[PDB]
Amino acid sequence: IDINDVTPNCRVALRNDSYTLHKILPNKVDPLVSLMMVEKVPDSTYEMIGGLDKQIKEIKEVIELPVKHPELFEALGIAQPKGVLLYGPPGTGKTLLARAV
Amino acid sequence: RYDSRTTIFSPEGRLYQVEYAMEAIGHAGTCLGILANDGVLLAAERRNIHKLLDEVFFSEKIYKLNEDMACSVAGITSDANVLTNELRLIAQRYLLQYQEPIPCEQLVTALCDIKQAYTQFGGKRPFGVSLLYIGWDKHYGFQLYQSDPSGNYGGWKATCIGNNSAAAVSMLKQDYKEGEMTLKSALALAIKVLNKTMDVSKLSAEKVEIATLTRENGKTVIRVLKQKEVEQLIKKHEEEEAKAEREK
Amino acid sequence: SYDRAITVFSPDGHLFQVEYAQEAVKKGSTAVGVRGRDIVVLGVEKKSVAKLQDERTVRKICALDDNVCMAFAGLTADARIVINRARVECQSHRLTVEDPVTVEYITRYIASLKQRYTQSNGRRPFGISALIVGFDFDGTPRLYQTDPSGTYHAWKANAIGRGAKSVREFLEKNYTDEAIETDDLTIKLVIKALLEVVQSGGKNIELAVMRRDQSLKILNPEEIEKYVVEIEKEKEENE
Amino acid sequence: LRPGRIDRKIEFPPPNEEARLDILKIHSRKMNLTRGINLRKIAELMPGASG
Amino acid sequence: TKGPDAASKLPLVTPHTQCRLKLLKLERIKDYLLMEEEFIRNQEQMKPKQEEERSKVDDLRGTPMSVGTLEEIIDDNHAIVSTSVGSEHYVSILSFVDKDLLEPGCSVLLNHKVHAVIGVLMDDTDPLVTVMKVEKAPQETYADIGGLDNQIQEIKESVELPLTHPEYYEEMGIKPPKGVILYGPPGTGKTLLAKAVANQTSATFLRVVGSELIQKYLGDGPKLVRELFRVAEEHAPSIVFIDEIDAIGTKRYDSNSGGEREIQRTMLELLNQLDGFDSRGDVKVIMATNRIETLDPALIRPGRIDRKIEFPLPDEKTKKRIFQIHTSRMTLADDVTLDDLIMAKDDLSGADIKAICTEAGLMALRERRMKVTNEDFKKSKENVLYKKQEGTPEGLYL
Amino acid sequence: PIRALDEGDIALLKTYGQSTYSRQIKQVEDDIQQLLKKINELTGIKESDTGLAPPALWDLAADKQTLQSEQPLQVARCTKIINDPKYIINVKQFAKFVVDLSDQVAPTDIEEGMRVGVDRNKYQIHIPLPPKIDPTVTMMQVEEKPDVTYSDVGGCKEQIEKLREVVETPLLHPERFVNLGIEPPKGVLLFGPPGTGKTLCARAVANRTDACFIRVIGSELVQKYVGEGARMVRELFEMARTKKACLIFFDEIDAIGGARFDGGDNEVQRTMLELINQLDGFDPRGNIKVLMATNRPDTLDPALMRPGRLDRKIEFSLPDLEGRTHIFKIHARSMSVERDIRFELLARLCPNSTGAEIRSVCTEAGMFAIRARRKIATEKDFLEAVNKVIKSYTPRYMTYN
Amino acid sequence: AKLVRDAFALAKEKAPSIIFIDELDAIGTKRFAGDREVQRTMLELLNQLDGFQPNTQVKVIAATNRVDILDPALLRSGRLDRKIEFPMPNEEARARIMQIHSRKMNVSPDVNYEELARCTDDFNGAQCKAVCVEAGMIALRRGATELTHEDYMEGILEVQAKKKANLQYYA
């Protein structure tokens, strides 16, 4: 293990006898924040969302285009949009679109 | 907060109670009036359409104030009744002192002054009644006036107050031909506006009330359309909608 | 916690309700008034009334007497009542004393009514600041401003309503004896002062012009158009 | 809700007539519909469905 | 002493536009970078005494070496060191430890077996504090702010000018303002002016959120604040930026809750460090709040926050400057007359005068155009200005 | 009708445009970032300083001799002595042991309650140790007089006189109080608007305290572990008692002295209850004059504010006109101001402003004089500073006159 | 719990002993991880109280400024039951307090302690002693060898931080 790979707060493992580092180990993540990472993708798909073509395109302009092709924004000279907010009457399809994304 | 009483001024200088009343005026049923070259008309929506309710007056929202005036209502029932009674009293008092009909704007200003006095003196809640005025006078002829809970009136060619007042007013602005509307065209436009101003489809005749002001041989007859002519107008609008969709 | 009653003094001796009422005057259409040797002008901005409403009932410049006119700001409901009471007071003063009501007297009565309304609870202060201008002095032009509080002041040229600070700054740096030496130049000064506050075309400025021993003359849009054309010509000359 | 933390606020109005028909088709794909099951009439019977 | 640990930053490239002059500048910077890399790579390789002393010291020290707290100094070769588990040990002080630094409360380094003191831990800074230190300076400089001139001048006189030209203040006899509060509507340029100051400043810059100063444990909050200010003082010229101050600076009020009383205690520790017994030293505090009416009067009183810089919503000239700044990179078309959108009613902020730019770019992308047009800007404004619902009165006033 | 982008459209957008230099510049930027990271990793050390003395200072090969010969000794306190005598020793938190002395020490040396060292294997007592002197409590002392004297505090003649009568006069001249049978108040609670100058008076007292001055850090008294804050308060008051005529300053007493409520603060409340009985109750406190300050006196527990613990309650009101003028002169003594500056007008233009606001106005006037390259700040600069500092933070003034 | 048990055992060993648990609120807070240890300390005390053989030779006296915060179980029947109530001193109480705490000082025989008691409504014993001490200190300020009634009134003013001035409307 090189000293350059041990960044602060890296959760190393130390040998019991001499306490020498022999591994880097995955970084510690608070137990409760781990459950917020979507490991199993939901079943909702875009074709299941109807009547929201404009909304789907608008959301993909921020969730897909900036990350898929950042060079377009770099050339255009505009900052990549960061966040998108969904609001409307209850049961209109916001969570469905979130699952589809 | 600064809405404990009407007399209290907000730091920005807003009568919070008056604004609250003017916002609450939106709960009232939709009413509108289109000024036409030959007269002016009013349209109202009967929110209560229960089968067990007997229609005895036929003018729940449209009242006759003078021989040449009439004013629709929108707002609290008790406040509306008090305001209409005061309007009749003011008009008849003016007739008695001057022996000629009130020139409309005088009655509007008197009612607005009463409402302003209520919104100023402490211990009185603002009149949450916004009522449209129509009438003809020797000075300016046909006029339509809007009264708000704050006493701020204003001349208007076509306005709607109550439910979805914004949409009705906007699409009246979109399709109102200044100085080229006849009473028949005015009624057609009023029915068209009322059709989508209310969620109820088919614009049932029993659910809409229309009154028209006309100048016939110097009499100023106020006529409340009977159900037959209202149904005829609704059928005409339905046929016009079918013709328009024919293009599709 | 001292801003919920008119008759309650703050620890620093402020009648906070009156100060809040002045904020209402701060929210109205600008009014500019400048008095000349033989002319008194009351500038006003129109608010581009709705497409489908009549502007005859939105009169903001009204004459209390045959030779005294006032332009107000603030809420119209209170301004109308103040105007009506001022008219009744002028007709009563004429009745008791045949001499026509002086501009000073009408301004004093308006201030007295406002003060009486801002002196006890259960009576909200009048949220309109009135610029009363008139040749009622029988050969002398006078202009006054009645604050919503109740104090009046004699002003050669003052501004009320939205943009009052900018219009006052313009008037201070441009109102000189050479400026108002003639009626036309006084009207041009009024138009120029109101132009910085109201950036728009014609019909957005209503000018009430009163000459000595005359009646109010609400200038038609064409005349304001002619004066704006003249001012544009002057600006072109400067460049 | 500042235009730097939230850039795009997409509204989600209750589906209109065609939107309601599309939603009905989406959720009726696995259903065993019968001839004469016109969905336009059903959608017309839902004036303001939440979706 | 421990002079400033100023953030590192590469020089700035002026062309911006992808001209060959920018290519030459970047090539020169890369050449010097490769220069340094080659020099330092050859040094150790090209390299072929103190080794004996180092070996002896490390063999006496042994590994691992425990880090403990020195409780007292009994003799010149004996001290009481309390291990991390709270147990006190009467260990022997070895010769190779400067007795000058050995003071009560310091973190001593001990042998694992005999526990004999072998060294004194100097930094021992709380890891939650060493993170705050700004190492990579943000790229947003002063030229990246449209207008906010008066504000820039005030912030410079408070945090920037005093270091560069202290002569003026020394001769005038006035101690330069050592505290500035940035308050105003959201999206006005508060955090920006902070980023620009951090970029230009040569003093150590510490960033906090006003929510990381609060710790779950009872005494961790005040101690974290004390550690942060001690670290700032260690690097003499320092600027501490507490954004979102209104998180912990809320008006003190009788709270029947340890949470609230703990937050109030954190605020009290902050205001005691800022201006209380003992001078604050040469540490300048910059705070941002979109709500200054809710801050404790003590925290924002003169002496702690000496310049309450106001950040208003941009005016016409400022708005035109923020359109020029955020459209410079963009390839605008010939018909883009920004004045139309610049007019506005009263309520266009930088965030919008930038989201508007981003939305115009995206709408240009929709039509497959990399050069924006006036229609794109109007549509972007209409789409991105939908923030406030009413915020206005009715047609009452005339 | 908006149409999504395809692969060909993306390729043409990223190619149909500027491509003669864009690719080179982008690659140069990416590789420059990579080179910076490589350099940082290559150095990536910043060797942390350790307490290693100069080479000649230690130069000791007998350090290993002392390490191998000497043995670490756990520190413990002998709760009881048994009668060969046996000793009960509490090893802080480890456990309770019944050990006997090693031959090195004599039985007479070890007394009950004395903290003594013990070997890690048998727990035998080997050497006595001086009684614990807490490091935080000891660092809580001043031992460095701040450079603010009473001449720097203006507009508070009565308040300063009362403070001296409480904390200084009884210590310097006990006779004036003993002769007339007057017990001087042992505590003062400086409560007033923030920025009025309570801490300045405290610093002045510490400057001319000529006794033990202890500044109580509110952070240390509030400790993570239960019962640690009360222990710290009890150690501080013991360290005050061991000295003669000590002075304790409980700065920002509202930090811990909140009103008790029914877990809430709980632990801080326990520490407050410990200070309360220390200040007043059984076991008279002694010659320890307590100085407390707070800008919010209404949140203090009534027990802490009762005139038995805070005997004299000095109110630091906003300075009057004379006080403001004196403050202006005090803060403008060093400023290079002109000779015609009417400090009376500047005092009258700050109606309700503390000394801190006066200092802010003085600094603002100096900064204004520095803006335009002038080395003398004229009265106009002070007027502008007053407008910026007080007035900044017409129609309303129209009514007044 | 160990400390409380040891204290009670020491009280037992000495035959005529009394235990004074002052500031009982610290450990007597109503039942709600320091809470656990404090609840355990309380249980120990409630037990050492019930462990007493009735009318034993050890009596426990406790003090508190807040009975509401006190745990109801502490009072009960076999535990501390004699809730001796201490009221804010009455007129006679305040006068007597002033007399007791003004004994050591040179006091003018012209002092009307009854008037002072009337003038110090809502004053506890500690505040009354503070009033006496402040009157003495103020008398020292003027260099007066002997206290005066006006000095006592000024001390009463100073005890609550109040300042009296010649108002321009109270003539």
Ligand SMILES: Nc1ncnc2c1ncn2[C@@H]1O[C@H](COP(=O)(O)OP(=O)(O)OP(=O)(O)O)[C@@H](O)[C@H]1O
């Ligand atoms: N005056 C301005 N000039 C240039 N860019 C600006 C300006 N105001 C805002 N921006 C841009 O918009 C962003 C948002 O502004 P900033 O981060 O300063 O917000 P803020 O005032 O801190 O608001 P908040 O209260 O949300 O933290 C900036 O990072 C910058 O990119």
Ligand SMILES: Nc1ncnc2c1ncn2[C@@H]1O[C@H](COP(=O)(O)OP(=O)(O)OP(=O)(O)O)[C@@H](O)[C@H]1O
């Ligand atoms: N009365 C005064 N005379 C002179 N300078 C003063 C006075 N009051 C405050 N200052 C100046 O302001 C500085 C800070 O004021 P200080 O810390 O004493 O206020 P405070 O009332 O103790 O604050 P807080 O109540 O918030 O704890 C002082 O160091 C001094 O320079």
Ligand SMILES: Nc1ncnc2c1ncn2[C@@H]1O[C@H](COP(=O)(O)OP(=O)(O)O)[C@@H](O)[C@H]1O
């Ligand atoms: N436009 C739509 N297309 C397809 N399904 C929809 C649409 N609107 C609503 N739904 C259905 O309604 C349900 C609402 O779920 P959810 O997305 O959680 O609603 P909301 O976003 O209001 O919380 C979903 O299961 C979804 O299948």
Ligand SMILES: [Mg+2]
């Ligand atoms: Mg949902």
Ligand SMILES: [Mg+2]
């Ligand atoms: Mg920010």
Ligand SMILES: [Mg+2]
């Ligand atoms: Mg202080």
